Amino acid sequence: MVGLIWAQATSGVIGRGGDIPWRLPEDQAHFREITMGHTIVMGRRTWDSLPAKVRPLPGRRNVVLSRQADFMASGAEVVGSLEEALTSPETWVIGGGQVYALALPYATRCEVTEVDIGLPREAGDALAPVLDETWRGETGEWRFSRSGLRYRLYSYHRS
Ligand SMILES: NC(=O)c1ccc[n+]([C@@H]2O[C@H](COP(=O)([O-])OP(=O)(O)OC[C@H]3O[C@@H](n4cnc5c(N)ncnc54)[C@H](OP(=O)(O)O)[C@@H]3O)[C@@H](O)[C@H]2O)c1
Ligand SMILES: O=C(O)c1cccc(CN2CCCCC2)c1
Ligand SMILES: [Co+2]
Ligand SMILES: [Co+2]
After folding, report:
1. Binding residues for NADP(+), per the UniProt record (predicted)?
2. How many domains does the structure of the chain reveal?
3. Residue 31 CB less than 6 A away from ligand 2
4. Which of 61, 70, 102, 115 has the most beta carbons within 10 angstroms of its beta carbon?
5. Residue 77 is part of a domain; what is its CATH number?
6. How far apart are the CA of 82 and the centre of ligand 3, in A?
7. Residue 110's domain spans which residues?
8. Which atom of ligand 2 is nearest the CA belonging to 94?
9. What DSSP string runs through 131-156?
């Protein structure tokens, strides 16, 4: 089971300036519950985006993808191809835009949070992958976050 997990604005934006341009604490709790115990795979920019206090993410096998042969990630395995990163019964690809694009052909599930903010796509933004017809989705109810934002969860699958 290779899965992808991300949160996006309706427009598809997931990242900007090395950060996520919103906060949604219920989504972090959801992210932790889905990924905990498993292997997590991330691009080097996403690893750099985690504050040192939170990296590696606890209780998970952290794997970082870089083309730098000598890249060091204290607390994580570093691999040179996505295919080398995928492990064991369950791996979650946790970002960012480049690594989601690379991992989608190997993915069976996507767990997606849609954040209802009118955040327009800007040049240089990291974007979520677009899911074609092979994906089947189940739509959750809209909810309101402690942060003030409206959001809903999608669970996508394919066989
Ligand atoms: N759910 C979310 O909303 C969410 C989740 C995670 C991240 N983000 C955001 O996403 C943004 C970062 O996404 P990104 O797309 O800019 O960078 P990224 O995908 O996180 O990492 C990009 C890096 O991965 C490595 N890489 C890419 N293709 C590779 C390949 N084929 N083989 C080996 N290594 C490869 C390179 O690292 P080297 O340059 O070291 O070779 C490349 O610079 C940030 O803003 C972050 O906050 C959002
Ligand atoms: O699971 C956790 O414990 C945790 C800790 C810090 C942040 C997050 C949310 N995500 C994680 C991967 C993309 C960047 C932001 C989760
Ligand atoms: Co699990
Ligand atoms: Co299945």
Report:
1. 19, 44-46, 66-68, 96-99
2. 1
3. yes
4. 115
5. 3.40.430.10
6. 21
7. 1-159
8. 12
9. P-TT-EEEEPPPEE-TTS-EEEEEEE
